[PDB]
Design a protein around this ligand. Structure first.
Ligand SMILES: [K+]
Ligand SMILES: [Mg+2]
Ligand SMILES: [Mg+2]
Ligand SMILES: [Mg+2]
Ligand SMILES: [Mg+2]
Ligand SMILES: [Mg+2]
Ligand SMILES: [Mg+2]
Ligand SMILES: [Mg+2]
Ligand SMILES: [Mg+2]
Ligand SMILES: [Mg+2]
Ligand SMILES: [Mg+2]
Lengths: 151, 138, 337
RNA sequence: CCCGAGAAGGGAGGUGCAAAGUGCCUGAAACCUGAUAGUGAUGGAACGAUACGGCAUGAAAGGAUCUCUGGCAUGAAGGAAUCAUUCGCGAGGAUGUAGUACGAAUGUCACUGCCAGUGUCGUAUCUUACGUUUUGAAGAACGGGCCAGGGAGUGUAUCUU
RNA sequence: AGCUUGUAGUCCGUAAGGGAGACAACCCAGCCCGUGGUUAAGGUCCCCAAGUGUCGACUAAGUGUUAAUACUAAAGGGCGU
RNA sequence: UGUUCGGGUCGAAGCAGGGCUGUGAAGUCCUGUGGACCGUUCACAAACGAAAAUCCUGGUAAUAGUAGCAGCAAAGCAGG
RNA sequence: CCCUAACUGGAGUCCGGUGAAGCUUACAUUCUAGUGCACAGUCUAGAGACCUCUAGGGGGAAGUGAAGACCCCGUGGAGC
RNA sequence: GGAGAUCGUGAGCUGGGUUUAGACCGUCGUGAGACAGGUCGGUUACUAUCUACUAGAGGUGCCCGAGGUCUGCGGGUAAGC
C-alpha cells in the first residue's frame, strides 16, 4: 500500500539502493536467489541471473529444499527460479541506474545487501470438495537491494 | 605402558579406568590377549558367546571380537564415556594384541593386585582364547 | 494361529543391496598354490553369448560320449600388462602394503587413469623388496596389472582398468623371483589359464536401477480380489505391531543389479586367437566383432556386454582334471535373426 | 531530474517541529527477512535451578575501602598433621603434642582496576512440562499450534451473624 | 489375585531434601534464608564421594552380587563340599 | 469519585530494552521511540487482575513451494 | 490361480508456472530391558548414533478424523 | 510340529462371520417388541509432520594437494536344505 524502510542502511556516499515493491513472486525462491547473489559484483550477479533465466545455471536451495531434486555439478537440491530471477534482475538494473545517477560506477560495485520482505497478501479462495472454500493467496514480495563500491 | 600378561581382566580394567579418570597420563596396555578371566572355561565361553551374539543388526550392541578391543570395551564400561571426562579418558587409552612395534623395548609395569597368581584355583581362561573362539584373527 | 510356511523371499547374503563401489570386481580371497609360479587372475571384457556343439566329456554324466549343445560366453582377453609388484607385511591388524616397484616402461594410455610413474627406482626398489623379504618383513607379493582395451572395438574405452592379482607359488622367494620375471611384461590368458579348466568369474552385474520388491526380492503379487484393490506389486506388511520398526530383512524397493558377484566353476571351453572363429554373421549385437584373442566360458557370466570380467583360478572347485573339450561346432549364425 | 513498457514502482530531491506520505497518530506480539554475539556436521531430549569456567558485552540508570590480591588481630560449632608411649591377632584404638595450628565470620591495614549485571556455550548435581480428572498423571487419560485482545460470585427481597 | 471386604498404627493423598537403578505411600528425614562443621539412612573395585579394609571360615555354581518388597521357583534327591 | 499535594512540548501516556529496590504482588529510574496528557495524600467505589474453558474474535505459522491444476472429450504444430 | 511377464495411454518421478488444507504444549538421531495408572522417543541402566537432502512402501508415534452410536449410570429425554 | 509377536499384521488387503437401520421362519410376549436360533440384504475415511527401515545423493570430520591400489575394525548369509 505504501513505501517501506530498508532493513540495512548503507552510507549514501558510496552506496546505491533499490526496492522491488510487492512483486507477485515466490518469497521462498526469491529468498534463495538473494542468498545466492549477495556479495557478488553487480556484473557477475547479472550474468548469473541471466544464466538462471536461461536454465544454464541452478541456484542452491538450502532452506526450502522440498520439491527440488539434486542438480548436476557440486550441488545438492537446486532450482531455476525464472520469475524471481527476472524480478530481482529488474531491481538490480534499477540499483545500477541509481548508482550511475549518484556518480558512482556500477562496474565496480558489490551486492552487499539483497533481502526479501513479505508484503501485504491479497486473499483469494480455492473452492474445495464438500462445500468448503480454502485460501489461495497472492503473496507479494519486497526486494531490498543495496550496492556499495567498498567492502 | 601396562603389561596385561597374567592379569585379571576386570581388576586391570578397574585400575586403568581409575587411573585414566585421575587425568594426567596416557595409558598403553600390551599383550591384551594374555589377560585372564577367572571362572570355568565353559561358563566364560557361554557368557561371551551370549554377549557376542546378542543385539540387533541395525541397532543392537556390537560386541567386539579382538582381545584388545574387548579389553578396551571392558574398560569402557567402567568410565563415564558418554561424558566429556569419559571421552577424554577413552581417547588416552590404547590397547594392543602383543607389543606394537613402536612400544617395543619400552619399560612396562604390572598391577600387583590384578595378578592371576592371587587366584585360588586353575579355573580361568586367557582373553585370547575367548577372542579366537569367537572367530577373531589376531 | 496355525501357520503355513514359506522360505524367506530372496537372500540376505548380499545385503545391503547397494551399487558396487567400483566398475571393477575386487577379489577378497585367493586360492592356494598347486604348482609352478603364475598369476592367479586375469581380466577380459564380455562380448556376448553363443553356443557350441561339443562331445560330452564330463565323467559320470548321462549324456557322456554324445553331442550336446552348450551355451558359452565369449570374453575378449587381450594381453594384460604387469604394472607393479607390491609386497605385503602381515601383523596382528592384518596385511599392510609395505613396498611397491612400478615397471620402468608403461603404456601411454595409462595416463587416462593415473599420472604415469616415472622410470626411476626399479633396481633399488626391487633390492629393497628383496631385503624386506630376507629380513622377514614380507608375508606375500601381489602383481598390479591393468587391461589395455584400446585394441578392442566393441569396448569404447581406452582407459585401462587396474587391479591387484595374486601370484601362485610354493614359497615367497619363488613368488618374488617369478614376479620379477613378469614385471613390465604382457601376459597372455594362456599364461594364466589352460583350456578345459574351471575358473571363477567376478563382475558387476547388469544394473536395473531402482526396482520394486516383486522384481528385487521376488515377493508374491496380490492375488485374486486383492490384485485390483490398489496394492498389487507392494509387500503385504512392513512389520508387526511390535517390534515397532521395519526390519532390514523386510523386502523393499531399491537398487537392483550393478552388484559385484562371483560365479564358481565356470569351465573354459576354448582359448582362441582368431576372433573370426566366434564372431557371428552381422556381428555381436550392440558390440561388433571380436578382434584379438578371446576365451569361451561355458554357461553364463555376470555382467552385460563390455563389462570387465575378472577370471581367477577356482577357490571351491570339486572335480579333478577335466580335459580338453572337443568342440565340434561353434555357432556363428546371426544373433540378430 | 534519472531508471523503468509504465498514469506502477524505485532512486535522487523537496514540504513539514516531526513523514505523520493518504485504510496515513502511537505502532506491541505472534509470524517473516536480514544482521550481530555465542555455539555448531562424535551428538541425547521438559528447553530450567544451582555452582564454577570460555567467549561477547558491561554508555545511563548499579558499587569506589567497591572489585582484585595479600598481611595482621579476634574468632562460634568443629578441629588436625607429624612424632613419642601404650593397647590390639589385625585393619586400627587410646594418652600426650592439642582444645593447639587452623576454622563461618567480624574488624583493620595495604595492594589492585575491576566487579555487579546481561547474552551464549561448556563442566558438575538435580528435575519425565503445565492445568485438569484422579487413590495414583511424564502417561499410551482429557485440554491448548502460536500471539494479541475479550472471558466467570452480580443485583433485589428476606433471614441470620 | 497389584482380588474383595474389616480392624490398629503410620503414611501417600497434601511431604520437600538424602538413599534404595528408576520407585505416590520402603529407609533417613518432616523443610524459613545463607555459610561452616558433624552425622543419619545407605555406601566405600570402576562407573561414583569414601576400603581392591582387617580377622575367621564357606561357595566353584558367574551360584550370588535382590532390607520391606505386587519386583525373589517347589516337593523330592545329592558317596558335591 | 471526593479530597490533599503535584508533574508535562526544556517532552505526558504508551511502547522495546536495561539499572536499582522489594520475599513477592510490584514499584521506581535510565536509554531509545513517541507527541499530549499524567500522577499523588487520606478515603470511597467497581463492567477491577487470565495460561488453560475441543473458550470467543482477530492476526499469523509449521505443514510447503507440498497436494491439486491427469482418469469422464490424451491437441496441437509451422510460418507471419 | 500355478507365476507372473511384456507392452499402451494417464498420473507419479525430474523441470517451469500457479498454489491450498488437515494432526501441532515442548523437545526430539534412536534401540533393548526395566520402571511407572500394570502398553515409554523423553524416567532408570545399558546399547547405539557425524549432519543435510532425495526417492519409497507404510512398521511405530497405543498416527489423524468424531466429547463411543457397545455397556452402565442420570430420581435426563423421545417415540411406541 | 505346536506356540508368541495388541489372540503380530484393516494410515496393507479382504469382508465370509459377528456387531446398526429392512425383511422372513420358529419360539416367547396381550402388545410394542425380543431371542445367547436360523435365514436373505447391507458405505471399509486421510495428500505421512516425526521416527524406523530400504536405496540414492550433497557436505563436514579425518587429511601435505591429488590420484590409484589395497587393508579390514566390523555388518550380513541358508547359500544351501
Ligand atoms: K509364525
Ligand atoms: Mg504468488
Ligand atoms: Mg456444492
Ligand atoms: Mg485480558
Ligand atoms: Mg510407612
Ligand atoms: Mg484429590
Ligand atoms: Mg502426611
Ligand atoms: Mg523423596
Ligand atoms: Mg489469553
Ligand atoms: Mg439416583
Ligand atoms: Mg497396521
Amino acid at each position: 500500500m505504501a513505501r517501506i524502510n530498508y532493513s540495512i542502511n548503507g552510507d549514501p556516499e558510496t552506496t546505491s539502493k533499490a526496492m522491488g515493491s510487492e512483486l507477485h513472486i515466490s518469497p521462498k525462491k526469491s529468498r534463495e536467489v538473494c542468498c545466492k547473489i549477495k556479495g557478488m559484483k553487480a556484473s557477475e550477479a547479472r550474468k548469473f541471473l541471466e544464466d538462471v533465466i536461461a536454465m544454464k545455471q541452478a541456484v542452491p536451495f538450502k532452506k526450502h529444499h522440498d520439491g527440488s531434486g539434486h542438480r548436476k555439478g557440486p550441488m545438492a537440491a537446486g532450482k531455476y527460479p525464472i520469475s524471481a530471477s527476472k524480478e530481482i534482475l529488474k531491481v538490480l538494473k534499477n540499483a545500477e541506474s541509481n548508482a550511475e545517477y549518484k556518480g558512482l560506477e556500477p562496474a565496480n560495485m558489490y551486492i552487499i545487501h539483497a533481502a526479501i520482505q513479505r508484503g501485504r497478501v491479497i486473499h483469494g479462495f480455492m473452492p474445495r470438495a464438500r462445500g468448503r472454500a480454502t485460501p489461495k493467496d497472492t503473496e507479494t514480495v519486497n526486494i531490498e537491494m543495496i550496492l556499495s563500491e567498498v567492502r | 605402558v601396562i603389561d596385561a600378561k597374567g592379569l585379571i581382566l576386570g581388576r586391570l580394567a578397574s585400575s586403568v579406568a581409575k587411573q585414566l579418570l585421575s587425568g594426567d597420563e596416557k595409558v598403553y596396555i600390551i599383550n591384551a590377549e594374555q589377560a585372564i578371566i577367572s571362572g570355568s572355561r565353559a561358563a566364560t565361553l557361554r557368557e561371551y558367546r551370549e554377549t557376542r551374539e546378542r543385539g540387533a543388526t541395525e541397532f543392537g550392541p556390537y560386541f567386539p571380537k579382538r582381545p584388545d578391543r574387548i579389553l578396551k570395551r571392558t574398560i569402557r564400561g567402567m568410565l563415564p564415556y558418554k561424558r566429556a571426562r569419559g571421552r577424554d579418558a577413552m581417547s588416552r587409552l590404547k590397547v594392543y594384541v602383543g607389543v606394537p612395534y613402536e612400544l617395543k623395548g619400552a619399560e612396562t609395569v604390572t598391577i600387583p593386585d590384578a595378578d592371576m597368581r592371587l587366584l585360588s584355583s586353575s579355573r580361568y581362561v586367557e582373553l585370547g582364547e575367548v577372542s579366537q573362539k569367537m572367530g577373531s584373527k589376531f | 494361529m496355525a501357520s503355513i510356511h514359506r522360505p524367506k523371499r530372496g537372500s540376505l547374503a548380499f545385503s545391503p543391496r547397494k551399487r558396487a563401489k567400483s566398475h571393477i570386481p575386487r577379489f577378497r580371497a585367493w586360492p592356494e598354490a598347486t604348482g609352478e609360479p603364475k598369476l592367479q587372475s586375469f581380466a577380459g571384457y564380455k562380448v556376448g553369448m553363443t553356443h557350441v556343439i561339443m562331445v560330452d566329456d564330463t565323467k559320470n554324466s548321462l549324456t557322456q560320449g554324445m553331442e550336446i549343445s552348450v551355451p558359452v560366453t565369449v570374453i575378449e582377453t587381450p594381453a594384460i600388462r604387469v604394472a607393479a609388484i607390491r609386497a605385503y607385511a602381515e601383523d596382528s591388524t592384518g596385511e599392510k602394503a609395505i613396498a611397491e616397484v612400478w615397471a620402468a616402461d608403461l603404456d601411454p594410455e595409462l595416463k587416462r587413469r593415473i599420472p604415469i610413474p616415472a622410470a626411476g627406482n626399479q633396481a633399488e626398489a626391487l633390492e629393497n623388496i628383496g631385503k624386506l623379504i630376507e629380513e622377514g618383513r614380507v608375508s606375500d607379493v601381489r602383481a598390479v596389472i591393468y587391461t589395455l582395451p584400446k585394441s578392442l572395438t566393441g569396448v569404447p574405452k581406452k582407459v585401462p582398468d587396474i587391479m591387484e592379482s595374486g601370484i601362485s607359488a610354493r614359497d615367497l622367494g619363488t613368488k618374488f623371483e617369478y614376479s620379477k620375471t613378469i614385471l613390465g611384461t604382457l601376459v597372455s590368458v594362456t599364461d594364466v589359464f589352460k583350456n578345459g579348466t574351471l575358473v571363477d568369474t567376478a563382475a558387476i552385474t547388469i544394473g536395473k536401477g531402482t526396482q520394486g520388491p516383486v522384481k528385487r526380492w521376488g515377493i508374491q503379487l496380490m492375488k485374486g480380489k486383492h490384485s485390483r484393490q490398489g496394492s498389487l506389486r507392494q509387500v503385504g506388511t512392513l512389520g508387526a505391531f511390535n517390534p515397532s520398526r521395519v526390519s532390514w530383512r523386510v523386502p523393499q524397493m531399491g537398487q537392483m543389479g550393478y552388484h559385484q558377484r562371483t560365479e564358481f566353476n565356470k569351465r573354459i571351453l576354448k582359448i582362441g586367437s582368431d576372433g573370426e572363429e566366434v564372431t557371428p554373421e552381422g556381428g555381436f549385437i550392440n558390440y561388433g566383432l571380436v578382434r584379438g584373442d578371446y576365451i569361451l566360458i561355458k554357461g553364463s557370466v555376470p555382467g552385460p556386454s563390455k563389462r570387465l570380467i575378472r577370471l581367477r583360478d577356482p577357490i571351491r572347485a570339486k572335480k579333478a582334471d577335466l580335459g580338453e573339450p572337443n568342440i565340434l561346432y561353434i555357432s556363428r549364425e546371426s544373433k540378430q535373426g
